[PDB]
Subunit: 103 residues, 3 copies
């Protein structure tokens, strides 16, 4: 198992490509994105998107978060949070030695 | 980074508005909801997943308790909680920001 | 609250039924699946799938992960990771005595 930070970004759908570009410029090895509905305090739910990015370091997750927020969160609704995770399998994330290599 | 409990509610799609109403009455700052599936009690049956970030464990438990008592003896559902830290979130962290 | 491991499997949509079968054979008490995207090997977004499975033990989650990866991950793209969670309500996960 390889330690990882799971960075979650929930924001307005129109920022999809802009945020993907930031994630791709970060060094991150991938991301997953999904459609969601969002309410923040006539249905009032709006369409949003949620990105999930697993990063090897906490610093990379914060860089992505910081860059997204500083660029867009003055003007667009969003939330960014982080969860601890462990990657058990992931050719790209762990490399070809796998996620439980020794040393 | 502000500690948060991430409360997840997975249940029947027909309960969407009813659960949202509970989350809106709770003081929670917001929620996300998505369409998901599972095999269904009966190939994949559509259901829904709510994610609510709460500042306290007690708020997450109050929501969970309310939803579960009101609906989960009559409808299928699971509620669980994960630890998260919010880095950014104007509404969640307030104007003081997430140094909380 | 009952401790749980949340196993997450993100992989190619064509594997949906095959991975479900492995989860069903594992002893796991359920799963949720959703439609997601990633950038794709080729810009814009390629459809894929995400499974979330809550397991009572860490070893059951790893058994599922090991069976999926060995069987499919030399030939199909995927990532499997695990988060700690606590189940607050879940008739199937916790049994009729409740999550405590
Ligand atoms: N351990 C777990 N990990 C991740 N997600 C979980 C889970 N337990 C439940 N879920 C999610 O919550 C929904 C309601 O599940 P519940 O167990 O109340 O109600 C279930 C249960 O009564 C029965 N069922 C499904 N799978 C089962 C299994 N493996 N063992 C026993 N009963 C199952 O079918 C009903 C509807 O299930 P469906 O999968 O459509 O819908 C599920 C699924 O999306
Ligand atoms: N930044 C990058 N660097 C190198 N190669 C890249 C890449 N982004 C995409 N790829 C390549 O394309 C495949 C499919 O990626 P996609 O984003 O569609 O779909 C991904 C994605 O939704 C999810 N995933 C992968 N890594 C992730 C991460 N670090 N965080 C969150 N989700 C991830 O797992 C699916 C299968 O991923 P997998 O890595 O097996 O396989 C990847 C990988 O071989």
């Amino acid at each position: 198992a390889k330690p990882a930070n799971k960075l979650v970004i929930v924001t307005e759908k129109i920022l999809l490509k802009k945020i993907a570009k930031i994630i791709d410029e970060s060094g991150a090895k991938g991301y997953t994105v999904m459609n969601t509905g969002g309410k923040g305090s006539t249905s009032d739910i709006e369409a949003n998107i949620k990105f999930e990015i697993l990063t090897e370091t906490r610093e990379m997750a914060e860089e992505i978060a910081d860059r997204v927020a500083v660029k867009y969160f003055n003007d667009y609704a969003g939330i960014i949070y982080i969860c601890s995770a462990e990657v058990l399998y992931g050719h790209t994330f762990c490399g070809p030695e796998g996620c439980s290599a020794w040393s």
